[PDB]
Amino acid sequence: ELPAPVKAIEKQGITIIKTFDAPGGMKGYLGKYQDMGVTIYLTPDGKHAISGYMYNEKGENLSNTLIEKEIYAPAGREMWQRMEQSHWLLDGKKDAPVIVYVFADPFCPYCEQFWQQARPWVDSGKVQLRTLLVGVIKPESPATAAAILASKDPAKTWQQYEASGGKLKLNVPANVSTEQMKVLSDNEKLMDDLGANVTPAIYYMSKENTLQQAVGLPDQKTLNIIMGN
Amino acid sequence: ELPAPVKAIEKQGITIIKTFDAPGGMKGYLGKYQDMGVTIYLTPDGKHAISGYMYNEKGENLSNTLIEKEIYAPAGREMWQRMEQSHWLLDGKKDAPVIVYVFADPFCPYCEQFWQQARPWVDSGKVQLRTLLVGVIKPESPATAAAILASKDPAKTWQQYEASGGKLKLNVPANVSTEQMKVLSDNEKLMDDLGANVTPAIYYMSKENTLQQAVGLPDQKTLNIIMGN
């Protein structure tokens, strides 16, 4: 059974997930208090346990690294894949190291403003924006989004559309094609699954490889983080 | 110099107070982050350190015990002594295990209400209230407080005074004696030193032997704690 010291910490409202190997002959226990991940370390004397964060000589918070890798990283791994497998439009270099997904609607001022804010990083080749269009804000959103998808170079058309603040004139098709309709519907369901119905809904990966979200127009700090700066 | 792992934690905004002996061949470091006490433990491998709370087999939070004994207990040790050395009035058994000091004014509804709330514990002999009178609320507060001190049995008179909701009739002396004036002035300065100018200002010791304060009429939980329940 569980060592007495660890059982004492459980009584403090902690639920253990699993054990793991720790340095110095110490045994580790990964757990959670509410929605917060925690690490517990059984001492060498075996009669004590420490609930806290372990750091190494290089100054790395190993407990944080573990909690993010084992508890947070897995959370949005599938979501990231679903976005990657969707019909997104490329804005920037195909080999840009930083990938950012954005669910956007044609009639969305903040989508346009975010597009402008990102220019420095996209143009430098550091970041690539992958846009998943949706048609949910205005009556004409579906048709306009489909019209963009229907153009000769959808990615370029979207870029011009955002740059113009949504004023760019478009060739309006007689109807939304079944493929365009599928893309829009599939994208809206994924957006819904991600939990944010407001556009722009921006998704990115932290330096620790965990899925992050930003809804609306990012402030300066959030923008810099989304851009991997 | 300080081990690398510990130096890393210092960079996280911690200032070390001193080192201490920890179990399992671990070295302990007592510090503070802002006004918060923290304990750091250097691992046996010496290449890691854990910032957190250590628990023993009996479930005692040793880090909390240490932080309170070394950081908090000393804080009000002198204040407690100054109260004990003042001219307080006894309400309850001289040998009551729980001692509670109260700075009170004669014209104070909440002082009276707190007096009533404490009856169960005082009458059972568990708690003794030691009142340090002050005359700061009303123009007549000084004279009334002195009149109580001037009575045949000051402690009994105060008890009757509080029980009556401040209606008890008193023999009013021609003036405040120099001794009464000294008691009132000394008590007001100590009260001022404690940081609370509002009466009642209640002082007590926690189960961990640290000085606690309650200002105004305690709610049910605070009352139970003051009474050592």
Q: Which of B71, B106, B125 is the last residue of a domain?
A: B71
B109 and B204 together in one domain: yes
A207 and A162 together in one domain: yes
The answer to whether residues A132 and A86 touch, using CB atoms and an 8 Å cutoff, is yes
Nearest to A8 among B5, B45, B55 (CB): B55
Which residues of A, range 164-183, sit inside 8 Å of B by Cβ? none
Q: Which of A71, A95, A125 is the last residue of a domain?
A: A71
End-to-end Cα spacing for chain B: 47
Give the domain CATH number at A149.
3.40.30.10
The alpha carbons of chain B give a radius of gyration, in whole angstroms, of: 23
The letter for the amino acid at B176 is: V
Q: Which of B71, B89, B108 is the last residue of a domain?
A: B71
Helices (H), B11-85: 62-67, 77-84
CA distance B45 to chain A (A): 5
What is the rounded distance in angstroms from the CA atom of residue B138 to the CA atom of residue B187? Answer: 16
Q: Name the residue of chain B whose CA is nearest to A5's CA.
A: B57
**Backbone phi, then psi, for A63, in 5-degree steps?**
-65, -40
Which chain A residues are Cβ-neighbours of B67 within 8 angstroms?
Answer: none
What is the rounded distance in angstroms from the CA atom of residue A126 to the CA atom of residue A140? Answer: 34
Q: Which residues pair with B27 in a beta bridge?
A: B21, B42
Domain range enclosing A6 = 1-71
A129 and A201 together in one domain: yes
Nearest to B23 among A3, A45, A58 (CB): A45
A207 to each of A11, A74, A99, how far by Cα in Å?
Answer: 34, 14, 12
B129 and B188 together in one domain: yes
Which of B47, B54, B58, B66 is the best mutation test for A, with the most CBs of A within 10 A? Answer: B54
CA distance B5 to chain A (A): 4
Contacts of A198 (CB under 8 A, 6+ apart): A215, A216
CA distance B172 to chain A (A): 57
How do strand A98-104 and strand A127-133 relate by DSSP bridges?
parallel
A110 and A160 together in one domain: yes
Query: Torsion angle of alpha carbons B94, B100, B103, B109, nearest 10°?
Result: -100
Q: Which residues pair with A104 in a beta bridge?
A: A133
How do strand B98-104 and strand B127-133 relate by DSSP bridges?
parallel
What is the rounded distance in angstroms from the CA atom of residue A216 to the CA atom of residue A138? Answer: 17
Give the domain CATH number at A35.
3.10.450.70
B4 interfacial to chain A (CB closer than 8 Å)? yes
Residue B70 per-residue DSSP state: I
Q: How many domains does chain B have?
A: 2
B15 to each of A55, B24, B38, B39, how far by Cα in Å?
Answer: 16, 24, 9, 11
B38 and B88 together in one domain: no
Which residues of A, range 33-72, sit inside 8 Å of B by Cβ? 41, 43-60, 62
B93 and B194 together in one domain: yes
What is the rounded distance in angstroms from the CA atom of residue A37 to the CA atom of residue A142? Answer: 42
How do strand A48-56 and strand B89-91 relate by DSSP bridges?
unpaired
The answer to whether residues B76 and B42 touch, using CB atoms and an 8 Å cutoff, is no
B76 and B62 together in one domain: no
Question: Strand runs (DSSP E) across chain A, as ranges?
Answer: 15-21, 27-33, 36-42, 48-56, 89-91, 98-104, 127-133, 201-205, 211-215
Query: Torsion angle of alpha carbons A212, A215, A219, A225, nearest 10°?
Result: 20
Q: What is the resolution of this structure in A?
A: 1.8
A55 and A79 together in one domain: no
B37 and B93 together in one domain: no
B91 and B154 together in one domain: yes
Helices (H), chain B: 4-10, 62-67, 77-84, 109-123, 141-150, 154-163, 178-193, 220-226
CA distance B11 to chain A (A): 9
A39 and A80 together in one domain: no
